[PDB]
Amino acid sequence: SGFRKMAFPSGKVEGCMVQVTCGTTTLNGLWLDDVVYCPRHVICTSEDMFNPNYEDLLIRKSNHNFLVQAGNVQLRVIGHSMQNCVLKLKVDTANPKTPKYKFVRIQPGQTFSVLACYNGSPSGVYQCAMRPNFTIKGSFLNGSCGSVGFNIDYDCVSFCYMHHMVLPTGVHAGTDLEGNFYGPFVDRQTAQAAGTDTTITVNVLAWLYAAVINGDRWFLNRFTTTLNDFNLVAMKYNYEPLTQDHVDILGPLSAQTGIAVLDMCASLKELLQNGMNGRTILGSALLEDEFTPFDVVRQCSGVT
Amino acid sequence: SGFRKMAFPSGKVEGCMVQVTCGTTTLNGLWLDDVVYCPRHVICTSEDMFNPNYEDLLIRKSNHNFLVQAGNVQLRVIGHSMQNCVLKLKVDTANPKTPKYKFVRIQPGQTFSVLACYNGSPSGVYQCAMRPNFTIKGSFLNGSCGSVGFNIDYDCVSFCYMHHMVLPTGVHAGTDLEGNFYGPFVDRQTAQAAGTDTTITVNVLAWLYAAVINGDRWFLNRFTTTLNDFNLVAMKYNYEPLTQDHVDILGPLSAQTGIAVLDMCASLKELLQNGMNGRTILGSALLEDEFTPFDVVRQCSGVT
Numbered sequence: 001s002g003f004r005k006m007a008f009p010s011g012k013v014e015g016c017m018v019q020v021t022c023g024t025t026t027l028n029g030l031w032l033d034d035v036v037y038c039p040r041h042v043i044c045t046s047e048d049m050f051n052p053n054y055e056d057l058l059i060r061k062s063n064h065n066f067l068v069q070a071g072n073v074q075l076r077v078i079g080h081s082m083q084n085c086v087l088k089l090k091v092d093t094a095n096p097k098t099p100k101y102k103f104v105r106i107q108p109g110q111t112f113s114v115l116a117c118y119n120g121s122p123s124g125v126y127q128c129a130m131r132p133n134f135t136i137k138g139s140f141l142n143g144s145c146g147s148v149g150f151n152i153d154y155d156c157v158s159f160c161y162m163h164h165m166v167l168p169t170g171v172h173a174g175t176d177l178e179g180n181f182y183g184p185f186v187d188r189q190t191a192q193a194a195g196t197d198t199t200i201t202v203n204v205l206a207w208l209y210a211a212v213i214n215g216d217r218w219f220l221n222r223f224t225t226t227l228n229d230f231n232l233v234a235m236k237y238n239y240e241p242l243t244q245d246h247v248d249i250l251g252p253l254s255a256q257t258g259i260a261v262l263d264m265c266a267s268l269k270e271l272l273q274n275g276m277n278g279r280t281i282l283g284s285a286l287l288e289d290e291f292t293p294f295d296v297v298r299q300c301s302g303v304t
Numbered sequence: 305s306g307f308r309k310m311a312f313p314s315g316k317v318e319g320c321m322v323q324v325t326c327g328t329t330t331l332n333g334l335w336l337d338d339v340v341y342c343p344r345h346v347i348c349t350s351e352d353m354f355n356p357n358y359e360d361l362l363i364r365k366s367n368h369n370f371l372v373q374a375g376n377v378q379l380r381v382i383g384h385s386m387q388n389c390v391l392k393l394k395v396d397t398a399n400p401k402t403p404k405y406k407f408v409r410i411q412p413g414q415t416f417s418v419l420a421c422y423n424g425s426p427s428g429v430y431q432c433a434m435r436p437n438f439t440i441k442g443s444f445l446n447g448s449c450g451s452v453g454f455n456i457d458y459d460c461v462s463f464c465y466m467h468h469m470v471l472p473t474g475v476h477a478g479t480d481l482e483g484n485f486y487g488p489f490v491d492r493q494t495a496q497a498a499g500t501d502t503t504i505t506v507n508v509l510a511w512l513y514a515a516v517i518n519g520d521r522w523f524l525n526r527f528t529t530t531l532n533d534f535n536l537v538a539m540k541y542n543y544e545p546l547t548q549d550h551v552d553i554l555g556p557l558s559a560q561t562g563i564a565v566l567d568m569c570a571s572l573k574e575l576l577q578n579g580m581n582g583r584t585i586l587g588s589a590l591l592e593d594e595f596t597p598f599d600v601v602r603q604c605s606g607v608t
């Protein structure tokens with residue numbers, strides 16, 4: 001009953017967060033086994049950040065320049081390396097709280113939980129989606145870099161995001177745990193902008209299925225459509241085109257509800273063409289697109 | 305940068321969640337020190353739940369009828385007591401993960417984080433507000449009862465909610481950790497309904513201040529108003545009346561932004577009278593009222 005934007009429990013990740021200070025810059029790192037991962041711009045001063053030469057800046061940093069603190073306890077740095085846009089600080093102690101973990105690069109449309117942190121201390125947790133233009137709409141302040149995004153499949157934490165920067169539009173950009181940015185962005189303070197923020201059609205349809213499951217059906221109409229006809233209207237509205245794989249992925253939701261995917265497409269089309277007329281769906285006056293089909297099934301079936 | 309509905313990190317609470325089974329009914333309990341707290345309707349069968357006599361049902365339950373499991377490990381129940389609508393199961397082992405904690409009863413308008421659980425295992429976390437009609441809009445399925453709501457002030461967890469039931473409108477009702485329901489509700493499956501779900505005016509104003517902080521200012525107009533004139537319009541819209549204490553509580557937000565509270569009231573009034581005209585504020589097409597003034601300052605200042 002009810003449907004909410006919901007994050008994974010953050011306990012396994014809280015125990016991996018540390019503070020990393022180099023010079024005057026402080027941010028967060030992720031401590032797994034005997035390695036701390038953090039954004040490489042920790043080495044930049046306020047000035048450096050506009051056109052850094054990271055390799056050159058890194059020549060003048062030695063192991064003892066990276067101050068790593070876990071709680072009130074200092075860790076000893078015994079090595080360091082740059083992998084793309086992240087640093088790997090080898091420490092002399094394996095994190096006793098290291099969970100079963102993996103590093104994954106997610107695709108646009110997929111969702112993950114962000115544990116926002118400051119000074120190595122968890123601040124709060126919320127759910128995000130990797131948007132088609134490879135930005136996320138999170139909540140980050142100065143010092144939040146190194147905060148990570150993750151999913152949990154039972155016992156295993158899959159890290160997929162590390163925060164690096166905010167863009168002129170207020171949306172956020174970052175890397176996977178190998179240091180490769182999502183999107184065309186780079187970790188420097190130059191002119192760079194996001195790109196068209198299109199809507200995750202399949203996710204909206206999943207969310208419409210969630211509403212029906214929870215008894216909110218006012219938007220179901222008597223019509224159906226075709227995939228080709230739907231996309232012609234959807235893309236007038238900057239919706240990602242819907243494919244047969246998307247249809248397949250909504251299959252189980254379609255069967256649980258007895259509503260053909262294309263029938264639901266017909267309902268979405270009229271919502272786009274006519275609006276909500278001041279009504280709401282699952283408490284929203286907008287079509288919500290940051291729930292995947294997996295997300296909906298999860299929350300409507302009690303998976304733990 | 306950015307503004308999101310955000311929950312406290314759930315780690316300290318994850319370690320307190322256990323599974324409680326009596327007869328055929330399974331739900332969650334909260335294990336603090338040597339006591340497990342859980343809803344008393346764990347003792348009801350499917351039939352009992354329509355007009356239970358809990359005292360009478362409790363006569364036939366002994367310590368060994370309450371199966372308490374922490375992970376894959378069974379706890380030994382050595383005593384039991386009913387306090388209002390919750391049971392206190394004394395166990396022979398103090399929870400080694402017990403945090404510094406307190407039990408508090410919150411007021412309508414205040415917010416807290418819910419850790420949704422099933423079979424004693426955390427499922428996900430999300431932020432809620434205690435609404436003026438003493439319901440919450442969460443995400444709960446069968447077996448979720450005993451999940452708890454909490455705030456964290458640095459090191460101390462303040463438990464304020466335990467889930468018990470869903471209402472015909474799909475909203476949720478529960479108790480504080482002393483077993484007293486919020487609102488007039490009772491833990492039986494009889495005809496009972498919520499009451500008018502009015503809007504937390506002060507919280508909407510806080511959220512409007514959050515938008516301005518994050519550069520979303522399109523809704524600021526050239527007008528001001530009075531508290532009396534504003535409330536005359538606000539209560540046509542089922543908004544809780546705004547008081548001088550509310551004004552005081554928005555003081556720091558008013559000073560950080562240079563916008564008098566009554567000027568912002570004038571902006572809210574025109575948004576109520578004229579709508580959003582299809583625009584959004586912080587990504588919402590609705591006036592959001594589940595952020596307190598404290599919530600906004602927290603998230604816009606990096607408190608950990």
Ligand SMILES: *[C@H](O)[C@H](C[C@@H]1CCNC1=O)NC(=O)[C@H](CC(C)C)NC(=O)OCc1ccccc1
Pocket residue numbers: 027041044049140141142143144145146163164165166167172186187188189305
């Ligand atoms: C790292 O913690 C930080 C996160 C930004 C700061 C405010 N909100 C965020 O999400 N990243 C940077 O400061 C970043 C550093 C370069 C090496 C990319 N630069 C950046 O995002 O610049 C834009 C900006 C900075 C400060 C305030 C507002 C916008």
Ligand SMILES: *[C@H](O)[C@H](C[C@@H]1CCNC1=O)NC(=O)[C@H](CC(C)C)NC(=O)OCc1ccccc1
Pocket residue numbers: 001331345348353444445446447448449450467468469470471476490491492493
């Ligand atoms: C306890 O886990 C459970 C939570 C309900 C079930 C579905 N979603 C919820 O939030 N509470 C009950 O089942 C409760 C038991 C009585 C002792 C109050 N009764 C209840 O909420 O009845 C309404 C209902 C039950 C089952 C499905 C849909 C509505």
